[PDB]
């Protein structure tokens, strides 16, 4: 039940505790930062404030101001009028309180508090320079093949999914790109439930009994169209369990001249089915790469009801760090509010949540101990428009708060998949 | 500048499909060089006369959250009755809708107008899946008001008795609408969870004849 492993390696939840338990509070108003001390006895005499402004990851300004705050007191810090941003994007402000001198309990340079705000945002209005290339639609009884130069997209007409992609003669997928509404159950999803003594109120059991894990996709529609400068693929699927429709998924794929695939997804969720664990897509990628790069919340694991500690910046970690090694394996390694993701030859743009690793949701839920896991061929990807909270007020009864349950009935998300 | 903002056209293309015609548009609302709103739409007209409209709006994070995200027009038709499947039968808003019930409702046009002595936005009905007026039918998941008075007349006139009915019927169909508040009437009182602050909004509508 610990915040740390038995060998004292931190769980991701330790960072969330550090941030919420901070001793300095911050408000922003125009160009003024207000800092409040929550110390009862000491002055801030080993503290200074580092601030920085970045446009979509790229720094534009930074600076330092010594902190001089009495117990329970306030200090007003006025930012210099900041250089105007050139292009489009959202400006972000980050502050951190740094301890310059070593103590009996910390190293010099130790970070004790932090906070972020959105500043000015300029929206992209200018039409991206209209390219000339034009994608080529090839139709057979079993498939739709889209070709742009030497890039190839294959849609299966029987199953209704993007079943393979090609750059030249190099294939990208080991498993087709499909919808996903399930996660490998966390301890909070399971609670005190067991094979010998089932607890029907637990999230895992409501999910099992409704047939979420056994749901079979059934194609409703699958059409292909040529436009002026692109090809459009329209699909619709029903997920059913023994006659009862659980979810309907409606998608458009738009592949244009610049070689980008715009995916638009619209999902309906039956009001009387237990709210699903996630609403997204998954596939098994052929490529295994070293690093993972993203513009979003990080660097550590973060979930919708546990993402306050994470900051919005540009992050770059090795693949093995995007997986959290819980002793009892479960869904893990998510990062939220991501605008861009980069892995090997692939780039994904939008506003989504993701995890990425060598283990599939199926392997994670079938294995009881972490040492028993084996890396699978390629890399398993999950990209969710929406993901249920993880809870934790206790681990023996539903604890996910109402504002974190996927309960809206109708959902929308869009992604762009291209090459970097 | 929300009231003074002018729609600038970014894109407007047409494509013929196997069974339909698809119109794509994009607009940007600006004031003194700042982009407030961007609206991206597709209209799809299929073989059965139905028009499917898809809208995606971006709102600038540093502009004050908008009062509504929707569409308007002035219809030529003046009909006796309004018929809808949604919350009703009385006026209801996102932070004042619990009393309303979901069902099929049917009222004379004049009932779709609340005669507040000082005139303002009035008459909204929320959580609607279907609206009927004359030979028109709208389907989706939206909020609406319908009346003989433009938002503009309503905002320029000070006493209800000084209002005059306009030719035809003004229709407002919103994907989203800001709460009304009222914990008091002398400071901002709309609670955070009823402000339109998500930055990106999506809604869809089918328009047909019946
Ligand atoms: Na008025």
Phi, psi angle pair for B169, to nearest 5°: -125, 120
**Chain A, chain B: beta-carbon pairs less than 8 Å apart:** 36
Task: Count the residues in chain A.
Answer: 420
For residues A174-212, one letter each, b for 16 or more C-beta atoms within 10 angstroms of the residue's C-beta and e for the rest, the string is bbbbbbbbbbbbbebbbbebeeeeeeeebbbbbbbebbb
Per the CB < 8 A criterion, the answer to whether A308 and A20 are in contact is: yes
Residues 157-186 of A with CB under 8 A from B: none
Dist. CA B206–CA B172, nearest whole Å: 15
A304 CB contacts (<8 Å, ≥6 apart)? A336, A353, A387, A388, A389, A404
Chain B residues close to A121, C-beta within 8 Å: 60-62
Written as six digits, the tokens of B131 are 């609206």
Give the Cα-Cα-Cα angle B70, B73, B79 (nearest 5 degrees): 120
Torsion of CA A384, A390, A396, A397, to 10 degrees: -80
**Interval between CA A9 and ligand 1 midpoint (Å):** 64
Interface test with B, best of A31, A117, A225 (most B CBs within 10 A): A225
Distance between CA atoms of A79 and B42, rounded to whole angstroms?
A: 43
- Sequence-distant (≥ 6) Cβ neighbours of residue A400 within 8 angstroms: A188, A203, A305, A388, A389, A390, A391
Task: Give the other-Cβ count within 10 Å of A82's Cβ.
Answer: 14
* Alpha-carbon dihedral A258, A382, A335, B59, rounded to 10 degrees: 50
Give the tokens for residue A43: 């002055």
Q: How far is A225 from chain B (nearest CA, A)?
A: 6
Q: Name the residue among A116, A233, A184 with its Cα closest to residue A357.
A: A184
**B positions 38-57 inside 8 Å of A (CB):** 38, 56
Do A171 and A162 meet the contact criterion of CB atoms below 8 Å apart? no
A156 is written with which tokens? 């299966």
Q: Domain spans of chain B?
A: 1-210
Burial class for A165, CB neighbours closer than 10 Å (0-12, 13-18, 19+): buried
Per-residue CA distances from A256 to B53, B138, B191 (Å):
22, 32, 43
CA distance B131 to A153: 41
Residues with Cβ within 8 Å of A9's Cβ and at least 6 positions away in sequence, in order, are none
Helix (H) or strand (E) holding B155: helix B151-156
Cross-chain residue pair A123–B38, CB shorter than 8 Å? yes
CA distance A87 to A85: 6
Mutation test of the interface with chain B: which of A404, A412, A416, choosing the one with the most B Cβ atoms within 10 A? A412
Q: State the residue for tokens 């003074």.
A: B4
What are the φ and ψ backbone dihedral angles of A187, each rounded to 5 degrees? -55, -40
Phi/psi for A326 (5° steps) reads: -60, 145
Contacts of A118 (CB under 8 A, 6+ apart): A90, A91, A92, A93, B61, B62
Determine contact: A227 vs chain B, CB below 8 A. Answer: yes
Contact B60 A125 (CB under 8 A): no
Q: Which of B74, B42, B56, B64 is nearest to B165 (CA)?
A: B74
Distance of residue B11 Cα from the nearest chain A Cα, in angstroms? 8
Q: Say whether residue B200 is in contact with chain A using an 8 A CB cutoff.
A: yes
Which H or E run includes B207? strand B200-209
Contact flag B61-A127 (C-beta cutoff 8 Å): no
Q: Which residues of B touch A228 (CB under 8 A)?
A: 13, 15
* Torsion on CA atoms B128, B129, B134, B136, rounded to nearest 10: 130
- How many residues are recorded in chain B? 210
Phi and psi at residue A141, to the nearest 5°: -75, -30
Helix, strand or coil for residue B29?
A: strand
Output DSSP code: residue B93: B
Q: How far is the CA of A379 from the centre of ligand 1 (A)?
A: 61
Whether cis (ω within 30° of 0) applies to the bond prior to A49 is no
Residue located via tokens 């740094």: A98
Q: CB–CB of A255/A418 below 8 Å?
A: no
Three-class DSSP category at B23: strand
Whole-number Å distance between alpha carbons of A302 and A333: 7
> What does CATH list as the number for A22-127?
2.60.40.10
> How close is the Cα of A167 to the center of ligand 1, in Å?
62
Q: What is the phi/psi pair of residue A328, to 5°? A: -95, 110
Find how far residue A69's CA is from the centre of its chain.
37
Whether residue B35 contacts residue B26, with contact meaning beta carbons closer than 8 Å, is answered with no
Residue to mutate among B60, B129, B194, with most A CBs inside 10 A, is B60
For the A128-420 domain, the top CATH level (class) is mainly beta
Tell me whether residues B17 and A225 touch, CB distance under 8 A: yes
Q: Between chains, do B62 and A228 touch, taking CB under 8 Å as contact? A: no
A123 to B58: CB separation less than 8 angstroms, yes or no: yes
Chain A residues within an 8 Å CB radius of B22: 227
SS (H, E, C) chain A: CCCECCCCCECCHHHHHHHHCCCEEEEEECCEEEEEECCCCCCCCCCEEEEEEEECCEEEEEEEEECCCCCCCEEEEECCCCCCCCCCEEEEEEEEEEECCCCCCCCCCEEEEEEEEEEEEECCCCCCCCCCCCCEEEECCCEEEEEECCEEEEEECCCCCEEEEEECCEECEEEEEEEECCCCCCHHHHCCCCCCCCCCCCHHHHHHHCCCCCCEEEEEEEEEEECCCEEEEEEEEEEEECCEEEEEEEEEEEEECCCCEEEEEEEEECCCCCCCCEEEEEEEECCCCCEEEEEEEECCCCECCECCCCEEEEEEEEHHHHCCCCCCCCCCCCEEEEEEEEECCEEEEEEEEEEEECCCHHHHHHCCCHHHCCCCCCEEEEEEEEECCCCCCCCCCCCCCHHHCCCCCEEEEEEEEEEC
Please report the residues numbered 54 through 113 in chain B whose beta carbons come closer than 8 angstroms to any beta carbon of chain A.
56, 58, 60-62
Give B75's strand partners: B169
Which CATH architecture best describes the domain B1-210?
Distorted Sandwich (2.70)
Residue A77 tokens, joined: 């810090």
**In the structure encoding, which two tokens stand for residue B133, read together?**
């007026």
What gap in Å lies between CA A97 and CA A39, rounded to an integer? Answer: 14
Per the CB < 8 A criterion, the answer to whether A195 and A286 are in contact is: no
Quote the CA–CA distance of A383 and A279 in Å, as a whole number. 9
What backbone phi and psi angles, to 5 degrees, belong to B156? Answer: -100, -20
Give the C-alpha separation, A51 to A67, whole Å: 12
Q: Measured between CB atoms, does A130 come within 8 Å of chain B?
A: no
Calpha distance A404→B98 (Å, rounded)? 22
Resolution of the entry in angstroms: 2.5
Of B15, B61, B141, the CB nearest to A121: B61
């Amino acid at each position: 039940n610990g915040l740390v492993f038995a060998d004292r390696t931190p769980h991701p939840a330790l960072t969330e505790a550090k941030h919420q338990q901070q001793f300095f509070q911050f408000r922003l108003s125009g160009q003024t930062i207000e800092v409040t001390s929550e110390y009862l006895f000491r002055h801030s005499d080993n503290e200074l404030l580092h601030w920085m402004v970045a446009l979509d990851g790229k720094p534009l300004a930074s600076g330092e101001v010594p902190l001089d705050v009495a117990p329970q007191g306030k200090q007003l810090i006025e930012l210099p009028e900041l250089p105007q941003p050139e292009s489009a994007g959202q400006l972000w402000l980050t502050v951190r309180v740094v301890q310059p001198n070593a103590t009996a309990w910390s190293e010099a340079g130790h970070i004790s508090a932090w906070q972020q705000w959105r500043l000015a945002e300029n929206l992209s209005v200018t039409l991206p320079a209209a390219s000339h290339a034009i994608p080529h639609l090839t139709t057979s009884e079993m498939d739709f093949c889209i070709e742009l130069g030497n890039k190839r997209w294959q849609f299966n007409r029987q199953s209704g999914f993007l079943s393979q992609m090609w750059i030249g003669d190099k294939k990208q997928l080991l498993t087709p790109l499909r919808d996903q509404f399930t996660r490998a159950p966390l301890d909070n999803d399971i609670g005190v439930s067991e094979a010998t003594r089932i607890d029907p109120n637990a999230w895992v059991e409501r999910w099992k009994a409704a047939g979420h894990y056994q749901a079979e996709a059934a194609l409703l529609q699958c059409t292909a169209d040529t436009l002026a400068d692109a090809v459009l693929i329209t699909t619709a699927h029903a997920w059913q369990h023994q006659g009862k429709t659980l979810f309907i998924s409606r998608k458009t794929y738009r592949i244009d001249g610049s070689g980008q695939m715009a995916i638009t997804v619209d999902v309906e969720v039956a009001s009387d089915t237990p709210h699903p664990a996630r609403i997204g897509l998954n596939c098994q990628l052929a490529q295994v790469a070293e690093r993972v790069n993203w513009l979003g919340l990080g660097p550590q694991e973060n979930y919708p009801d546990r993402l306050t500690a994470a900051c919005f910046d540009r992050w770059d970690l090795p693949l093995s760090d995007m997986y959290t090694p819980y002793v009892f394996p479960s869904e893990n390694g998510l990062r939220c509010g991501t605008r861009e993701l980069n892995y090997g030859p692939h780039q994904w743009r939008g506003d989504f949540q993701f995890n990425i690793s060598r283990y599939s949701q199926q392997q994670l839920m079938e294995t009881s101990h972490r040492h028993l896991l084996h890396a699978e061929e390629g890399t398993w990807l999950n990209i969710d428009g929406f993901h249920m909270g993880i809870g934790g007020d206790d681990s023996w009864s539903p604890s996910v708060s109402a504002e974190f349950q996927l309960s809206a009935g109708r959902y929308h998300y869009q992604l762009v998949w291209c090459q970097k």
